[PDB]
Scaffold this active site. Structure first.
Site, PDB file in Angstrom:
ATOM      1  N   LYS B 158      -3.547 -15.241  10.116  1.00 37.26           N
ATOM      2  CA  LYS B 158      -4.676 -14.521   9.543  1.00 37.26           C
ATOM      3  C   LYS B 158      -4.615 -14.530   8.023  1.00 37.26           C
ATOM      4  CE  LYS B 158      -4.918  -9.998   9.977  1.00 37.26           C
ATOM      5  NZ  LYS B 158      -5.203  -9.458   8.626  1.00 37.26           N
ATOM      6  N   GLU B 184      -2.713  -0.461   4.064  1.00 38.48           N
ATOM      7  CA  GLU B 184      -1.911  -1.653   4.271  1.00 38.48           C
ATOM      8  C   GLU B 184      -0.444  -1.284   4.345  1.00 38.48           C
ATOM      9  OE1 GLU B 184      -2.868  -4.686   4.973  1.00 38.48           O
ATOM     10  OE2 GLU B 184      -0.843  -5.509   4.983  1.00 38.48           O
ATOM     11  N   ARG B 185       0.246  -1.859   5.330  1.00 40.99           N
ATOM     12  CA  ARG B 185       1.693  -1.756   5.412  1.00 40.99           C
ATOM     13  C   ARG B 185       2.309  -2.285   4.130  1.00 40.99           C
ATOM     14  NH1 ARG B 185       0.610  -4.532  10.340  1.00 40.99           N
ATOM     15  NH2 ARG B 185       0.603  -3.132  12.155  1.00 40.99           N
TER      16      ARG B 185
END
Ligand SMILES: Nc1ncnc2c1ncn2[C@@H]1O[C@H](COP(=O)(O)OP(=O)(O)OP(=O)(O)O)[C@@H](O)[C@H]1O
Lengths: 506, 473, 55, 146, 120, 119, 73
Positions: B158, B184-185
């Site tokens: 991705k 977001e991580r």
């Protein structure tokens, strides 16, 4: 050039003239703005649902009154209305400009046009909260609304004053039915008789800006904008606008209703209006009901759709016909919202997703889509040559799951199966090509009486345009007979059978 | 000069109550500062309780606030530096860079709660954005200034897909990229930054082609409910000022809906149905309707979707799907056949795969492709059951053609030049339609299947056909 | 010959069983999702209802 | 006693805040142990931290912000409970060679209910972390252990 | 039980039945003491109160305490948080099941879900 | 039985038994098909699906939906009609002829109509 | 009338707080008949009581607790 500055300076004279009489028996400070609603101290002579104007241009409706303070809901983002500002009261129950001058324009919920074509030539103001007409100035419906689709006027006919529901699922072809009906009314909007014209008011709620932009572009390609009224309440704008905009559009419809003319309105889509209403009732601590639509959400769609029927001769024989659109969730007809629109409107056109997945567009499920006072107001010709067609599609639907076994059968089920497949492939239709009733009669007539049975299944799509051009080039007098008379006599029927069997033979 | 100084009266978790002295109050959605020993602590006024007292949601950690600290006002909303100097600089929702490359010398500072464009300026015919990847521009074309739902979990390429979009928009339309990780991580935030350095889309010395906005997970929910708006404003300045077609990447819009849920549940508003906030449609619209096409330029958005519990009647995907123009699925069963990218053909459907917009020829080619792969999928069981003897000449040619198409969908990447070493082929649309059209006719059936894997266009198809003809003899 | 006829008709019967099982799973998944959403809403209501009738 | 009999107590720090103790101890015990892990993380070492569990920790945080009269959300949990766990688990990392290549590695445990990942806390933790070692009873009764 | 444990030095059996009535009687007034009611309808003070009742019944080094606590479950639904908290507090959990009493076999011990700790 | 007569009560009990048997066997019909029953219960399911389509009645007010004039069937003919279909006097009649009918006399007549049409 | 047909009125006591009457009668009437039964029980006789039906009494007790502003469970 400076001509709009001339007009705006005349409006400055009005503003300066209004400043000479501005004494606002009303003003009060904004105590607190929170949850997207304002509490106002003062205004000791305000009305229930009276329009007010804050000091930043955001208007508001005062929907509740308490001893001590008044609660005013907003009409936009609350970014503008600041604490401690100044609240003049306008003086009006919530009204919108109605009249014929809106034809062509694109307004939002409060009559502010956003097309960029100058101010609204407004023939008057009318309330948003109008009491529906009682049971005495009503007549049961007796005039057709020729939608131009094949299957709609075949199976589920629409009367002037018959509230019909277009229910369906997401991206399953819901808007296209209403758009094709508006484009079909070009047959009479170019004409001269008023009582056959049919004005279209398309009321986009909760949709994107660019979708309404493309829809205005579509209604100016095919020239519908000499009779269209777009009321846009796009999902960028805040919730009480969406709570209001279909009601103001129903006032627009009632203006055409009381004045003798006939008018169609399309709500699209009220499952986002109930979203906006559950937002406004879950920010005022009113406790939710089943599936968190608040307990009066039946009453909302009630008081909306009940301002649309057929007035009798006592009031001027005008009308208003509504097509609300309901977005369900995955083929459901038993959530709490679509079991309230169904319990108001006079029938359903259930646009099932599975049939559009097989490309049969529009995807009317025939065995579910029914209308209650449609049958008394169809065109007489279709009612003569499609009195079998509903029962025949019921017959074909009976043997739908019986033929999936793959078992060899008798002759009668094979005959009905072939004719049913020809009728299912027959009712397809491309976008933006509504067929008038004068051409809907011969195609259905070729479908009913077994003439198609020698044709392969793939040729039917070009059989439609071929048989239509065969009748347009040669038997033009039969199309004029169906146009004028609207009814097939015996001689008309025999001539039509000859004209079928001619082109059927090759 | 004339400050509006008040006192913090109450700290409740991420909710902060600020008292102001009289006749001074800023309205809703205005930025407030608190100076800390650690830096600055930003608040956004969301509710006015009366009494010259406002109530805000946090934008950073609210430990250690003595009630009674001075509250400085900045009048406008949350300011963000915009423009050319922002490229390659990891800006948080405050407006300060966190890459430690010094302060950003940007020219203007923009508000983020702006108006969406008015109805007269909405572009009235959505054309097709030539992205550059073949299967995108063939089957589910991205709407120019439209919205695109990119599904699928991580590890299926991705990030490779999205860097490929970055390079191809940099080449073909010349547009810049604004990536935005809401929620977001943090670890994969750094891994994305390192990979975007090494792929060349971030040049720390030259001209990078992207602006990163990483709203991390360990910020209070008022941050994540505005990080997407920060990325949106950095998109809007590139749209309406310099006049381009800018790609706004948002991952992951369901975490933005969570941010909305927790902000409007911390404020004490009554929760809706399933438990998302009752301002769901409006606070999705204030993110969606600012991503559109005006007469100046356009911003096209690629935004992911985490489908909750694999269910599509839950209102957060059921609200995002009332806005998405075109979906794109990166499935498992396509990268498992070693296909780059893994754009699954049967699932990624567009609302702009229509002959009235893309033209008749494009729609015909795409419809035959979808029916070809549909028949291929419906045959794939009895291919294993019965073998290729039950195929008639009506059928065995369709199996061969569909294998040719399925191999032909893969494309050498502009970013997999350090992965696979094959240099990327930016394929135009007018090559793509003609190439798929010629394969659908049957003019290259003699060409073997192996010469269709990782090929740019029909010309490199012919070249690889000659090269594998030479290597076989 | 009756053995092969049995196994062909049994194969067709299990094919219809697999197809009907797939279809009725596509009904019960929709009932499962509506039941889950109605249950979460119809307990969040009676969590919230206590939080407004306080002293 | 089990860590004594195999002698892992040489390098083990147990932080017990068991169910006898009151709710703020259960609310603070993962953060306390997170700082204990960060002391090793800032000193070039490798510390495997294991929370066990985080369901009870969220139950105590629920008891706090329901008795503290903060308004509740889904399944009566507080609003910012994601901001609880996202502030916890992100304290584990892998430092650079510039800082000293210290490292903390986090293994939390979610006691789910009846074979579910649709509940609110497991949905939040799955949206944080890096995947599952998803364990089941049905595979346990086949004897497949673990 | 505690007085026979500490000040006596003796094996102590404790046959509590039932324990769910304790938490339920927490619920029957915690609505009325002005607590915001938690999830399904039990009190907020659940894990702490079940903690303080399941920690003073334990085997100290001054005496042996063997506890047998029959525990009700509402509507055979083990995902209810009121018996599910007790799962962490017990060593030998014999899980009965109405779906085995439907077969007439008594006692209806579900022979899978009744795990224990001493099955080393 | 002491209110409407013993025969009426017994007919109603037999009809609810047959329809309850159908609603119980609903699921196995949905999964596999009608072929996997016994040979008493397959006759029970077939007579049940006869009686369901026989429960229809063309209304005097819904005349415009179905195109059939109204049917006002008295009580005693209905009692005898259901007693006749329960006793098995008509088990070979096709099912569709029971549909949208008045009494059992019109069932015989409509089966004769469809007999003269299908031939 | 049915108990007068088969003649059980000699030993019957009907306490009928019907739905025409207000809500605390539906809250209270089982306990009143419970006292009526305990008079027979504290004198060495034998009494069978039948409450019918308790969901209506739960409805009335819900109505009494909500209208008196107690936080429901
Ligand atoms: N007759 C037709 N010919 C061609 N395309 C059609 C036809 N009917 C429907 N469609 C397709 O259906 C798609 C969606 O149409 P429509 O807007 O009616 O669906 P919808 O469910 O109403 O979407 P929304 O609810 O977002 O408005 C369009 O892309 C259009 O191409």
């Amino acid at each position: 050039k400076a001509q709009p500055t001339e007009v705006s300076s005349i409006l400055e004279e009005r503003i300066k003239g209004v400043s000479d009489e501005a004494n606002l028996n009303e003003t009060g400070r904004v105590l607190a703005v929170g949850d997207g609603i304002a509490r106002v101290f003062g205004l000791n002579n305000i009305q229930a649902e009276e329009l007010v104007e804050f000091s930043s241009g955001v208007k508001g409706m005062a929907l509740n009154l308490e001893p001590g303070q008044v609660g005013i809901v907003l009409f936009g983002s609350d970014r503008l209305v600041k604490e401690g500002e100044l609240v003049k009261r306008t003086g009006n129950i919530v009204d919108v400009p109605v009249g014929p001058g809106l034809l062509g324009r694109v307004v939002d919920a409060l009559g502010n046009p956003i097309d960029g074509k100058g101010p609204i030539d407004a023939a008057g103001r009318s309330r948003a909260q109008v009491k529906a007409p009682g049971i005495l100035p009503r007549r049961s419906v007796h005039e057709p609304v020729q939608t131009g689709l094949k299957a709609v006027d075949a199976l589920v006919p629409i009367g002037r004053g018959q509230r019909e529901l277009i229910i369906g699922d997401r991206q399953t072809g819901k808007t296209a039915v209403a758009l094709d009906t508006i484009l079909n009314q070009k047959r009479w909007n170019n004409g001269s008789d008023e009582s056959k014209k049919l004005y279209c008011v398309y009321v986009a709620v909760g949709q994107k800006r660019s979708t309404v932009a493309q829809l205005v572009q579509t209604l100016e390609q095919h020239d519908a904008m000499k009779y269209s009224i777009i009321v846009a309440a796009t999902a960028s704008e805040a919730a009480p606008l969406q709570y209001l905009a279909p009601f103001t559009a129903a006032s627009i419809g009632e203006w055409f209703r009381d004045n003798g003319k006939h008018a169609l309105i399309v709500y699209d889509d009220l499952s986002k209006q109930a979203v906006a209403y559950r937002q406004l009732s879950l920010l005022l601590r009113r406790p939710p009901g089943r599936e968190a639509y608040p307990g009066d959400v039946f009453y909302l769609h009630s008081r909306l759709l009940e301002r649309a029927a057929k007035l009798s001769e006592k009031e001027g024989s005008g009308s208003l016909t509504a097509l609300p659109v309901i977005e369900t969730q995955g083929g459901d007809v038993s959530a709490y919202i679509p079991t309230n629109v169904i319990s108001i409107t006079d029938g359903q056109i259930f646009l099932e997703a599975e049939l559009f997945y097989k490309g049969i567009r529009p995807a009317i499920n025939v065995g579910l889509s029914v209308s209650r006072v449609g049958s008394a107001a169809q065109v007489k010709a279709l009612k003569q040559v499609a009195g079998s067609l509903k029962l025949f599609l019921a017959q074909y639907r009976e043997v739908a799951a019986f033929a999936q076994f793959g078992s060899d059968l008798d002759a009668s089920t094979k005959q009905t199966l072939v004719r049913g497949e020809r009728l299912t492939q027959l009712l397809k239709q491309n976008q933006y090509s509504p067929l008038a009733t004068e051409e809907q009669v011969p195609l259905i007539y070729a479908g009913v009486n077994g003439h198609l049975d020698g044709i392969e299944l793939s040729r039917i799509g070009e059989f439609e345009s071929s048989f239509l051009s065969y009748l347009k080039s040669n038997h033009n007098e039969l199309l004029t007979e169906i146009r004028e008379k609207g009814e097939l006599s015996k001689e008309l029927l025999a001539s039509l059978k000859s004209a079928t069997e001619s082109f059927v033979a090759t | 000069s004339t400050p509006i100084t008040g006192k913090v009266t109450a700290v409740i978790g991420a909710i902060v109550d600020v008292h102001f002295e009289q006749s001074e109050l800023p309205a809703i959605l205005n930025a407030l500062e608190i100076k800390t020993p650690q830096g600055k602590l930003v608040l956004e006024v969301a509710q006015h309780l009366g009494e010259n007292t406002v109530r805000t949601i946090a934008m950073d950690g609210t430990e250690g606030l003595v009630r009674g600290e001075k509250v400085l006002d900045t009048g406008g909303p949350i300011s963000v530096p915009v423009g050319r100097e922002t490229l390659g600089r990891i800006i948080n929702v405050i407006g300060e860079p966190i890459d430690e490359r010094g302060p950003i010398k940007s020219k203007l500072r923009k508000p983020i709660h702006a108006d969406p464009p008015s109805f007269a300026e909405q572009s009235t015919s959505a054309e097709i954005l030539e992205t550059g990847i073949k299967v995108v521009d063939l089957l589910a074309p991205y709407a120019r200034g439209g919205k695109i739902g990119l599904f699928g979990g991580a590890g299926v390429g991705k990030t490779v897909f999205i860097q490929e979009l970055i390079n191809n928009i940099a080449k073909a339309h010349g547009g810049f990229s604004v990536f935005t990780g809401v929620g977001e991580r943090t670890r994969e935030g750094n891994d994305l930054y390192r990979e975007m350095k090494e792929t060349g889309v971030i040049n720390l010395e030259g001209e990078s082609k992207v602006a990163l906005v990483f709203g991390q997970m360990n910020e209070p929910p008022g941050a994540r409910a505005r990080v997407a708006l920060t990325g949106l404003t950095i998109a809007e300045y590139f749209r309406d000022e310099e006049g381009q077609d800018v790609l706004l990447f948002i991952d992951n819009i369901f975490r933005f809906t969570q941010a909305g849920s927790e902000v409007s549940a911390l404020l004490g508003r009554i929760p809706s149905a399933v438990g998302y906030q009752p301002t769901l449609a409006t606070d999705m619209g204030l993110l969606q309707e600012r991503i559109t096409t005006t007469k100046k330029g356009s911003v096209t958005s690629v935004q992911a979707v985490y489908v909750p519990a694999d269910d599509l009647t839950d209102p957060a995907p059921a609200t995002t799907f009332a806005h998405l123009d075109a979906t794109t699925v990166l499935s498992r069963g396509i990268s498992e056949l070693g296909i780059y990218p893994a754009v699954d053909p049967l699932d990624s459907k567009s609302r702009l795969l229509d002959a009235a917009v893309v033209g008749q020829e494009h729609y015909d080619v795409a419809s035959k492709v979808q029916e070809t792969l549909q028949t291929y999928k419906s045959l794939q069981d009895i291919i294993a059951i019965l073998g290729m003897d039950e195929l008639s000449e009506q059928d065995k040619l369709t199996v061969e053609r569909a294998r040719k198409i399925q191999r032909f969908l893969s494309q050498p990447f502009a970013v997999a030049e350090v992965f696979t070493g094959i240099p990327g082929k930016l394929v135009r649309l007018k090559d793509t339609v003609a190439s798929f059209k010629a394969v659908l006719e049957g003019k290259y059936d003699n060409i073997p299947e192996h010469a269709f894997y990782m090929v740019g266009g029909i010309e490199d198809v012919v070249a690889k056909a000659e090269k594998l003809a030479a290597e076989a003899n | 010959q009756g053995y092969a006829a049995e196994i062909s008709a049994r194969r067709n019967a299990m094919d219809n069983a697999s197809k009907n099982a797939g279809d009725m799973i596509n009904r019960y998944s929709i009932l499962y999702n509506r039941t889950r959403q109605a249950v979460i809403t119809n307990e969040l209501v009676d969590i919230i209802t206590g939080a407004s009738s306080l002293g």
